[PDB]
Amino acid sequence: FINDRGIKVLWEEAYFCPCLNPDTGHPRVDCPRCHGKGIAYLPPKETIMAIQSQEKGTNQLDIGILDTGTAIGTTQLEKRISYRDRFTVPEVLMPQQ
Amino acid sequence: PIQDAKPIDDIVDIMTYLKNGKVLRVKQDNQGDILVRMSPGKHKFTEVSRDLDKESFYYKRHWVLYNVSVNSLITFDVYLDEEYSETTKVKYPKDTIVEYTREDQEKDVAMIKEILTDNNGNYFYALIGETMLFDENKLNKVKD
Amino acid sequence: ISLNPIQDAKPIDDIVDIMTYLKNGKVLRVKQDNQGDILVRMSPGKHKFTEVSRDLDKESFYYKRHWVLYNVSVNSLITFDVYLDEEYSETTKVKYPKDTIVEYTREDQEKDVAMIKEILTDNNGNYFYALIGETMLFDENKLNKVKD
Amino acid sequence: ISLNPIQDAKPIDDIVDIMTYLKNGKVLRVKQDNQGDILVRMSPGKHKFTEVSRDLDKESFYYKRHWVLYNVSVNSLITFDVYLDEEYSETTKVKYPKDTIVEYTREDQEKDVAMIKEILTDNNGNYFYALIGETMLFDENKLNKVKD
Amino acid sequence: LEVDGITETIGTTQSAMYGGASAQILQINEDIKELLDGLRAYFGYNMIGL
Ligand SMILES: [Zn+2]
């Protein structure tokens, strides 16, 4: 049922990069593992997943326009997901200007 | 002649080299080159690294696990990393499609398989399905 | 003991000729990447406009092709390969058409690359291929097409 | 009055031999801890790739094994004990296999520990066990396996 | 089924009193009865004296 309704997706787990500065507790601006984000990622894994209520919430602010989208996912059996894990859907394209 | 490439034919040899622990280099189509390795220690599992350049005081290779498939190994070209030469400076690499005129001045398409050179750098090519050599000027690249 | 050569349908590349056929009233056949394969015709009589139909078959006495007005676009003609109905047909859906480059196995156990230059079929439907640099004809099962 | 010794299926420990059998095309049988027991084969013909099937039985005339492509992983072969199909079979699902260490009751009312070194079955299916340090053969009901 | 607001539902020809293919079987029997009886006329009835 999950494979029937879901969409093919790449799944990569998340882990804190070693580049975190031990004293400030904050990361290097640019390293291969993470390009400024304080979190690194593992090699991709392929999976089928179901997604609902894909939403592009946009906030118009003094700093500019910003996208805060929200969505709900339903996964397969025996898979344990972690906070700040990452998914990417190659098939689906999103327009921007 | 030049020996820049020493492809491995049998996967059994590849596994044997992997058991020996020597690093491999696996080509990809329209994608970055990759290195492969067998993990040391108690648990034996395949590891990969996107770092191609040689290990150095300023450059350290980064290795991670992966569930590599034999299908990539058996199909794609494989080499010993340390023995690999980065490039062979010729106009048309091997397995490159070109258009050539046959001996009877009739034109046919072909792909290249040869590496020969004098000591000045003048190169010659022998085409798949052909015997004699063809010059850099005679051959014409076939557009995709 | 074989059927004469069977010709491939030539896609029309230049816009000028396509319009010229259309002005004469000869039917065109366009393949749309997204939606469908369609016929295009300029209306008969003096009330001139472009018409589109999806009745993809020869106008049999029991198969009347039906037309509806549509505002065909120039860019649609340019981007999409178009054919003349009199050629495009089920008469030939050859796997490797003419001018296709294929990899074929030679007698010396070497796989050489060659282009198909002539096509004909035996009475049993097997397509015989003539290849550049070769005299005899070749069979579909023997061949291999390398893509990209 | 008994059947000849019955051999246990030897798990293949080294990757090199497993690939060598696979390159020759001899079928493998892998047990996955999570999902299932599967067969593995390298495709026949020149179009080479790995194939997987779940038709776990000898290829009878009325039982055709069906294959599908799958990207088998090296780590899967290493971690999971693998067998050759020609050995792994229902012909022997002995409770205590060869090389197993068991606790057996001796004539002196002392329970000694010994390893099974030979296995054979009588016509009634009872497995006779040969033990190190002992001459006669032993019965399954008499034995005890100590785990951990 | 119902999962997180997603639901998949199916009803089939299988029933407590009829099998899934019983419909086709019924049609097949209908075809055979006409066909078999018509074919019998080609051969006719048997007969033996006494
Ligand atoms: Zn980092």
One DSSP character per residue, B85-98 reads -S----SS-TT-EE
CA dihedral sign of residues A26, A30, A36, A39: negative
| Residue among A47, B13, A45 at smallest CA distance from D73 | A45
Judging by beta carbons within 10 Å of its beta carbon (0-12, 13-18, 19+), is residue B142 exposed, middle or buried? Answer: middle
Q: Are strands C137-138 and D50-53 parallel, antiparallel or unpaired?
A: unpaired
Other C-beta atoms within 10 Å of D64: how many? 8
Exposed e or buried b for every residue in C32-43, given b needs 16+ CB within 10 A?
Answer: eeeeeebbbbbe
Q: Is D34 on the interface with B (CB under 8 A)?
A: no
Contact B62 A42 (CB under 8 A): no
Spatial separation of the C-alpha atoms in residues B49 and A32, rounded to whole Å: 12
Contact A42 B64 (CB under 8 A): yes
Contact B102 C148 (CB under 8 A): no
From the CA of B39, how far away is ligand 1's center (Å)?
Answer: 23
A65 neighbors A57 (Cβ within 8 angstroms): no
Spatial separation of the C-alpha atoms in residues D114 and D130, rounded to whole Å: 9
CA distance B79 to chain D (A): 18
Other C-beta atoms within 10 Å of B90: how many? 19
Contact A50 E8 (CB under 8 A): no
Contact B11 D19 (CB under 8 A): yes
Q: Are strands B64-65 and B46-49 parallel, antiparallel or unpaired?
A: antiparallel
Spatial separation of the C-alpha atoms in residues B78 and B8, rounded to whole Å: 6
Residues of D in contact with B8 (CB under 8 A): none
CA distance C140 to chain B (A): 19
- A19 annotated ligand-binding residue: yes
| Residue among B83, B101, B105 at smallest CA distance from B139 | B101
From the CA of B35, how far away is ligand 1's center (Å)?
Answer: 21
Q: Is A66 on the interface with B (CB under 8 A)?
A: no
Contact D19 B12 (CB under 8 A): yes
Residues of A in contact with B48 (CB under 8 A): 43
Contact A1 E4 (CB under 8 A): no
- What order do you get walking across the sheet with B24-26 strand by strand? B64-65, B46-49, B34-38, B24-26, B78-80
CA dihedral sign of residues B101, B104, B105, B109: negative
Q: Which secondary structure element, helix H or strand E, spans residue B65, and what is its range? A: strand B64-65
Classified as helix, coil or strand, C135 is coil
- Provide the experimental method for this PDB entry: cryo-EM
With CA atoms as reference, the chain B residue closest to C103 would be B110
Interface test with A, best of E3, E6, E8, E9 (most A CBs within 10 A): E6
From the CA of C88, how far away is ligand 1's center (Å)?
Answer: 59
Residues of E in contact with A1 (CB under 8 A): 1, 3, 8
CA distance B5 to chain D (A): 23
From the CA of B86, how far away is ligand 1's center (Å)?
Answer: 29
Alpha helices in E1-50 (DSSP H): 22-43
